[PDB]
Design a protein around this ligand. Structure first.
Ligand SMILES: *[C@](O)([C@H](C)CO)[C@H](CC(C)C)NC(=O)[C@H](Cc1ccccc1)NC(=O)[C@H](CC(C)C)NC(=O)[C@H](CCc1ccccc1)NC(=O)CN1CCOCC1
Ligand SMILES: CC(C)C[C@H](NC(=O)[C@H](CCc1ccccc1)NC(=O)CN1CCOCC1)C(=O)N[C@@H](Cc1ccccc1)C(=O)N[C@@H](CC(C)C)[C@@H](O)[C@H](C)CO
Lengths: 199, 201, 213, 243, 204, 233, 204, 201, 199
């Protein structure tokens, strides 16, 4: 079962996800990526049902890119978030609802760093930090304990490490490696994968 | 609920909230979830209120009779095994109950987790209740066997606090007990509203 | 509530020889614990080179049969040629899968001659999954028929035996034998056995008798 | 709905509505494009300089995707329609197929759309022609041209709209391997070809270039004035000292 | 219950020539809190607020579609909207989904833009209006809020007594409910000004 | 079997004129004259209800129609088209009321009906309405008088006239009438401006008057018209 | 089905003055094989064998309790047990659990210890006896076994033809069943000797 | 069913059994579970027989039309995405189907797993079917990107074999294909009964 | 979810189990022991339901010890196995059935090394090697591939390592450490815990 995490700093957004694609009792992929580039400064972390995730996420993505092509400028992280929330909410009472939980990370030239949280019921909420999946139940409290609004990206990465290590300690699911990226004024930056040399 | 207990060099720290709900309704915020079995034996309390209270009280009775009969104090392992055996005979009948038996033994600091499901395991740290995960987070991020006393107090109190922050069914007041070799001592009983002011600013 | 299905029994068999193809079936139509009729063969002549066997729910058998007829005619009108056996197999696959979410309760085995004159069997499942075989059974007594043919025609589990190709005669007696044996154990199999032989000459129809209990 | 045949055959075998649409294309501002080694350049003529009009909001060069750009000639509104539908298609292709889009593919889509509008009831042919330009994976630079009829072809260099035959002849007589051997030289070729029909200026010319794995880059009037200065200098250092 | 999935509480009170509207700030999923600054009260114009409790998604969605129709209304007609009119609008919007209803129970509180006459109403999830002269409540802790309001509310309250009343009602009702709380926000609106305060509350 | 013509019957002439609308107006400026006067404390609508025979029953069909309890209608042009527009207007009003539980503002009803009239100048297989409408109303304290012509355009009037001799009537109202008038005075100058064209002995059955104050809209009884048509009262 | 949980196949055939009994060797749980040497045939004395197919636990348990009662019988009475007697014993043992039956269908094959007269029977899970002169089958692939036996069995077979017959029947029936197989064992028993062979079989 | 595919230096190895069951009854042991979509595209087949056959055949049709239209060969990613998109529109309707799309692409060796559930993931090795776990065991214990050709053949064949040994619903004959840059090649088709003799003694 | 494994050699029995005691989504114990000493040369590996495991296992254990005290000699591994199987089978159709899967390892002075496998339905089967739990589905085949009846204890330990590593690779459950013991003519010997330095 999948795990997402977002931590917003004063001028950046740090995001991380697990790299496991599993079915039944086996891991079928150890390098799965749960993140979707939608703008040069917007990442969409989607998680949940089998096909619903990729389908919905790619739909939103291509629509954002379509906006960019049609208008010459990209959607703001907020406009993006409300766009996805609108789409997800519209399909909620339809024949084809998408069972997806998501995070949206972004940087605006005006509003700065932003992190958004979305229920599968399409309830959108902005937060300094958030997490999805069972792992969240073990990590959120930690984030409560150590997070400060002025936290530096180094300290943020260290905090993320505390969380992931906690997952290694208490969580019954495997989850050996993690995709980690950051977003600022210079767009999306891939960081070294937090991994634990199990076997 | 949101009880937790961990053993370190200077004994066994035990902590709990005090909230009691009947659905979404908060029925009480003044519940003593740490039952004083013996002056050396404590029992945390999570799940069905009546179940926990009744069965741990009966456990206390049994331990007292043991003390009178064998002219010696019951061990932690024996108390936990007693409770586990009593509870197991009702497995499947719907008793909701998850408790921790803590104390000081002839084998030193003792801590056991006992389920209504049938579990009974010794361990260093434990957290039981609806907010157990949240407590587990901070407790694990701050635990050490070489923790000084006041540090252990801070760790436990804070863990229960954060638990009450995230868990909707946990709140009221953080209660804290310390189990030492000469018996246990009632450390603290701080309301969450005050701990908020203390921890935030 | 209401069930649109009823099992009508019936066993079905096809064997492919070098220059022939046998398609045989019992003639018992039953329902529940009763006999509807003792004169109901499950064999249907599609073309001079192709015969189809359909078992299971009689409604879907009749319907699917008439559909196959109509579409044979359509193909003939469309391409000025008759449907080759394998083509009928593929078509049947699509037709069966067209009801993937409301299947024909029908077990289908197609027996005939390919475009090189050789024999060929095609076994189907109720939703279109088919494959080419030398010999296959289907219907109620299928599990009783299959193992013997695996032994006698496939020469399986036999040490130092010769792989002599199946002649029409031996195949015929094999069919009669497995059906006679099936009539002993399967309660849905009995009354009569109709056998359809397909060679370059055409289609012969023979009728052996089975017990009536 | 409006079930009326608009585009029909004439007794001589012509589709008059389509021809009329082509005449509407003929009235459009000139739009040329050339294909080079590592660059591809599209430039549009008579931009109707009113100097009270925002240049950005009237550009005749539009990007369809990160891979493909496109210029046009004819009815601007129709062109907006076609361009947007093309962009939507470019995204849908990514949706149904993991791979992006080839220039040939989107060109074929646009062409098919136009033709569909030449043969449908109640509709009316798009009064535009398009110069589509891109660098599809494998590196091969490609340029295509479309027509209201629905016909489409590939070109090394071409021109449409106001005065298209003149620029076509010029490009025919000037397209060499020596010319367009360098990026600046290809751009200079486009600027020269445009100057051979435009009302002698540079503030009337909009030029844009696509190069390698980079994004589409529009040229500022300063850079255009620089290239035009070099062109006016090469026309006095190789055409003045010999005539 | 579907309503109890997110929890929450919304209340409105009447005053002399003022009106009040309050709501808790917790956004939670069943038993876990996700956010402590969740907006449940939205301004539908100057001196007219709406407060939605229930399923968070439908709160946001109803708010947004209502703002849609409202904007169109105040554009087609050259005026601000009346409280009664807004109420009927919400009622219609909700009843359009009679057989597939939004899971939210809206509470409208405002002052007549022409007069100043205070106004409070509440609605079903299917849009049945109910206007009162004292208070209206909607949420998972409606019984507690009723308990407080029936004992604290006085008729002609000044903008200061109204604040204290609605604040004590909200705080003490919410503190007996596990899925409502994590802060309380109060808007006290009068002809001249609008005063927005967040109360000191329990965070457990 | 039937379907419909999907193409516009109203198109632009090379000069730029929507000819069918202008012809519709020609139909309008040919029917019985109608005057409307806004008067501070109310509105008055009046029209020539001159039949063509003693055999006609004037107490069966009316030219002054109510839309709701507070909005009224008169017209100039073709009867049937008017009737259609009346039904449609009433329906629109009821829709507004069902949605908002508040009586529809006169301006809003006017705009909506105007949209309806606009449709028939562009929609397929139909001609525009040969009707101009005078719409009176009482909303938010103030009185309202509106006119809507076949093009779907609408104007707010203090006072005006339509139909035959609408120009002479317009100048008449422009001179022999002004603001601050009471409802009675307005009715008086309305029957007076109607008399400037009514070729014949103008009885109480030759003209129809409706009033709209802040107490609602209603049609004046033949008796009240008789009292007014006594050149006094 | 409960019977299909472990799978398996048991068959017995009659001969001239000999008798045969065979069974597959797979011990599996639903779809996974755990053991390839699982005993399903047990000797209830010299020249008298029983073969149990069905739920493995009840196979072992019925075998054990039957050996219990058998031993007590051959102790109380100064003789070996007759085939018919053993059959009635099994029938009684199974029927004692009429309303909570063991999930196994036993097959008895042997020779009369006094005479030599061959004997084969089978029973319900509730212990209804059925004696035959040709063959008896019990297992998840009973229909296949019936198919082979009805076509291969001849009356007076010598100890060599009987072996070939029961072996081909078992092999070819089992090879059309997914939960039966992983080897076949055959006991051919006659007055003088008992011959036990494991056949070459598919292991998939 | 029990199929497996893995990509190494010298292309993409594909292997499968051939058993087809209707309940516990073995309906066939001669099923071609590796569909030949294109001379460069293969598709494994597990789950509902008719479903897999029909949908992969339709996929082949679509790929052919693509080849004719675009005057070029479809990519592995595009084929897998095509199949995934087709199947997704029937999600929840009860299609049982789990396939692997293998081939050689302009990006070199390509291997995708596509579900009837909606999954679509690229990867190095994959095993699909009732006996997939057993195959995963030996395949993982013997895999390397630097495997020589015959070694890869041995690994695949053996993995499918052991799978057939443990899985009751897998058997018949191990079929083996090799996908190289100039297309795929039908490597082998060894019956399990023979492979038993080969591997045991 | 729990994992057991047994590998019988020519003169020894190697057994191993996971050390995780988990409830819900958290690991509650990282040093849980699933083995029960019943004789000086008999180990009982029990796994399954909550209280059923410990209750049943301890019952059997104390009964075996009672046999030892009453008779002066210990039960053979076979007699033990059939004793436990009898007890488990007797409770199967009773009011209190024990949902337990188990392995029994032993060494006899006469019969040598022995390994036994038991379903929760109390079906007893002897095997050269066996495994319990979901992990078995990933390990058994490996054991098929590499096991030989004459395997040395060093090679057996290495094989066990192959299995556990495979668990680290494919299994979605955590399972970081493992209890490993061996049994021969000298009784039960505790070996170094196979562990993987995750975190
Ligand atoms: C695979 O999974 C391995 C062998 C493990 O089973 C193979 C792979 C493929 C490509 C052959 N799959 C099967 O063997 C598959 C099992 C399965 C069945 C149904 C759903 C999911 C998996 N077998 C079939 O599909 C099978 C083909 C035979 C080779 C004839 N067909 C059936 O079992 C018929 C029903 C399929 C169906 C019907 C209605 C709706 C959807 C699908 N079976 C019968 O008609 C008879 N029978 C009735 C009662 O017992 C079960 C089936
Ligand atoms: C009245 C309050 C103070 C006590 C409360 N009791 C109750 O909720 C009793 C129990 C009745 C019962 C019948 C049959 C069998 C068992 C119980 N129920 C009722 O009083 C009436 N209700 C009917 C409809 O609403 C819900 C309950 C309770 O036990 N609450 C538990 C939660 C619970 C567990 C099992 C069943 C029902 C509820 C609790 O607080 N547990 C805490 C620890 C203990 C020691 C208080 C923790 O778990 C923390 C706070 C999270 O809830």
């Amino acid at each position: 079962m999948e795990y997402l995490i977002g931590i917003q700093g004063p001028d950046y957004v740090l995001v991380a996800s697990d790299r496991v694609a599993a079915s039944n009792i086996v891991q079928m992929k150890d390098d799965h990526d749960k993140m979707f580039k939608m703008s040069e400064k917007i990442l969409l972390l989607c998680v949940g049902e089998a096909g619903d995730t990729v389908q919905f996420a790619e739909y939103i993505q291509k629509n954002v890119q379509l906006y960019k092509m049609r208008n010459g400028y990209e959607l703001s992280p907020t406009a993006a978030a409300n766009f996805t929330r609108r789409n997800l909410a519209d399909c909620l009472r339809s024949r084809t609802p998408y069972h997806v939980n998501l995070l949206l990370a972004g940087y605006d030239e005006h509003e700065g760093p932003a992190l958004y949280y979305m229920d599968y019921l399409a309830a959108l909420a902005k937060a300094p930090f958030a997490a999805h999946g069972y792992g969240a139940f073990l990590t959120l409290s930690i984030l409560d304990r150590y997070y400060t609004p002025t936290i530096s990206r180094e300290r943020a990465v260290e905090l993320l490490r505390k969380c992931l290590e906690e997952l290694q300690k208490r969580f019954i699911l495997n989850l050996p490696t993690f995709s980690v990226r950051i977003i600022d004024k210079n767009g999306i930056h891939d960081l070294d994968n937090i991994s634990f040399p199990k076997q | 609920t949101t009880t937790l207990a961990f053993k370190f060099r200077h004994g066994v720290i035990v902590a709990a909230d005090s909230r009691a709900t009947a659905g979404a309704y908060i029925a009480s915020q003044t519940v003593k979830k740490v039952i004083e079995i013996n002056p050396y034996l404590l029992g945390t309390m999570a799940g069905g209120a009546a179940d926990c209270s009744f069965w741990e009280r009966l456990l206390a009775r049994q331990c007292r009779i043991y003390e009178l009969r064998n002219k010696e104090r019951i061990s932690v392992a024996a108390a936990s095994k007693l409770l586990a055996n009593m509870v197991y005979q009702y497995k499947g009948m719907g008793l909701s109950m998850g408790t921790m038996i803590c104390g000081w033994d002839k084998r030193g600091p003792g801590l056991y987790y006992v389920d209504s499901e049938g579990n009974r395991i010794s361990g260093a740290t434990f957290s039981v209740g609806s907010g157990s995960v949240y407590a587990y987070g901070v407790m694990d991020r701050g635990y050490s066997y070489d923790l000084e006393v006041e540090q252990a107090y801070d760790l436990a109190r804070r863990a229960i606090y954060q638990a009450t922050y995230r868990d909707a069914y946990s709140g009221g007041a953080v209660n804290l007990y310390h189990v030492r070799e000469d018996g246990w001592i009632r450390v603290s009983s701080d309301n969450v509203a005050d701990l908020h002011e203390k921890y935030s600013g | 509530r209401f069930s649109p299905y009823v099992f009508n029994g019936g066993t079905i068999l096809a064997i492919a020889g070098e220059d022939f193809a046998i398609v045989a079936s019992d003639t018992r139509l039953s329902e529940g614990f009763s006999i509807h009729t003792r004169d109901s063969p499950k064999c249907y002549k599609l073309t001079d080179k192709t015969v189809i066997g359909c078992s299971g729910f009689h409604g879907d058998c009749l319907t699917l049969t008439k559909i196959i007829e109509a579409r044979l005619k359509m193909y003939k009108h469309s391409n000025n040629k008759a449907m080759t056996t394998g083509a009928i197999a593929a078509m049947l696959s699509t037709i069966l899968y067209s009801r993937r979410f409301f299947p024909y309760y029908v077990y289908n085995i197609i027996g005939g001659l390919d475009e090189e004159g050789k024999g060929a069997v095609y076994s189907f499942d109720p939703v279109g999954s088919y494959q080419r075989d030398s010999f296959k059974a289907g219907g109620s007594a299928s599990a009783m028929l299959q193992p013997l043919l695996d032994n006698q025609v496939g020469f399986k589990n036999m040490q130092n035996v010769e792989h002599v190709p199946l002649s029409l005669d031996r195949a015929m007696r094999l069919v009669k034998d497995v059906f006679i044996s099936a009539a002993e154990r399967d309660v849905y199999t009995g009354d009569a056995l109709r056998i359809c032989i397909v060679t370059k000459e055409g289609i012969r129809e023979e009728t052996v008798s089975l017990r009536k209990d | 709905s409006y079930d009326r045949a608009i585009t029909v055959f004439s007794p001589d075998g012509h589709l008059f509505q389509v021809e009329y649409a082509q005449e509407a294309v003929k009235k459009g501002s000139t739009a040329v494009g050339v294909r080079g080694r590592d660059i591809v350049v599209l430039g549009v003529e008579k931009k109707s300089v009113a100097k009270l009009q925002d240049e950005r909001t009237v550009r005749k060069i539009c990007a369809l995707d990160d891979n493909v750009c496109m210029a046009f000639a004819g009815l601007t509104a129709d062109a907006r329609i076609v361009i947007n539908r093309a962009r939507v298609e470019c995204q849908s292709h990514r949706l149904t197929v993991e791979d992006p889009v080839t220039v040939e593919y989107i060109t074929r889509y646009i062409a098919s759309l136009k033709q569909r509008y030449t043969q449908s009831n109640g509709r009316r042919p798009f009064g535009i022609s398009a110069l589509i330009v891109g660098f599809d994976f494998d590196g091969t630079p490609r340029l295509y041209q479309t027509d209201p009829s629905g016909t489409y072809h590939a070109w090394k260099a071409n021109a449409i709209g106001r005065g298209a035959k003149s620029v076509r002849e010029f490009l025919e007589k000037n397209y060499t391997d020596e010319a367009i051997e360098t990026d600046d030289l290809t751009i200079k070729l486009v600027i020269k070809a445009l100057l051979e029909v435009v009302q002698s200026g540079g503030k009337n010319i909009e030029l844009a270039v696509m190069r390698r794995d980079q994004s589409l880059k529009i040229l500022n009037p300063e850079e255009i004035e620089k290239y035009v200065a070099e062109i006016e200098k090469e026309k006095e250092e190789n055409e003045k000292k010999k005539q | 219950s579907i309503m109890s999935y997110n929890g929450g509480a919304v209340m409105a009170m009447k005053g002399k020539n003022c009106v009040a509207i309050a709501a808790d700030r917790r956004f939670g999923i069943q038993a876990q809190m996700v956010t402590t600054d969740f907006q449940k009260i939205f301004p539908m114009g100057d001196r007219l607020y709406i407060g939605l409790a229930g399923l968070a998604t439908d709160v946001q969605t109803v708010a947004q579609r209502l703002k849609f129709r409202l904007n169109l209304y105040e554009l087609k007609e050259g005026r601000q909207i009346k409280p009664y009119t807004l109420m009927s609008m919400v009622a219609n919007l909700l009843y359009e989904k009679r057989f597939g209803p939004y899971y939210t129970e809206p509470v409208i509180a405002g002052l007549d833009p022409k007069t100043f006459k205070p106004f409070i109403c509440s609605l079903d999830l299917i849009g049945c209006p109910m206007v009162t002269d004292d208070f209206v409540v909607s949420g998972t802790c409606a019984e507690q809020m009723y308990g407080m309001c029936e004992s604290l509310w006085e008729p002609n309250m000044d903008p200061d007594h109204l604040f204290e009343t609605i604040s004590q009602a909200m705080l003490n009702a919410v503190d007996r409910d596990a899925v409502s709380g994590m802060g309380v926000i109060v808007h006290i609106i009068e002809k001249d000004k609008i005063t927005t305060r967040t109360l000191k509350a329990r965070m457990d | 079997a039937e379907r419909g013509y999907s193409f516009s019957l109203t198109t632009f002439s090379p000069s730029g004129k929507l000819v069918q609308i202008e012809y519709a107006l020609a139909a309008v400026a040919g029917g019985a004259p109608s005057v409307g006067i806004k008067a501070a404390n109310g509105v008055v609508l009046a029209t020539e209800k001159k039949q063509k025979s003693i055999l006609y029953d004037e107490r069966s069909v009316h030219k002054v129609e109510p839309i709701t309890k507070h909005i009224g209608l008169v017209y100039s042009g073709m009867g049937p088209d008017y009737r259609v527009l009346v039904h449609r207007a009433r329906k629109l009003a009821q829709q507004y009321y069902l949605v908002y539980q508040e009586p529809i503002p006169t301006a809003q009803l006017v705009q909506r009906v105007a949209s309806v009239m606009q449709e028939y100048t562009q929609s397929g297989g139909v001609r525009p309405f040969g009707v101009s409408l005078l719409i009176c109303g009482w909303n938010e304290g103030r009185p309202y008088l509106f006119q809507s012509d076949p093009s779907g355009a609408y104007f707010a009037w203090k006072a005006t006239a339509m139909g035959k001799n609408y120009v002479n009537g317009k100048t008449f109202l422009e001179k022999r009438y002004n603001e601050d008038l009471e409802l009675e005075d307005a009715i008086h100058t309305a029957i007076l401006t109607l008399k400037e064209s009514f070729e014949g002995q103008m009885t109480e059955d030759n003209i129809e008057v409706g009033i709209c104050n802040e107490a609602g809209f209603r049609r004046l009884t033949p008796t009240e018209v008789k009292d007014y048509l006594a050149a006094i009262a």
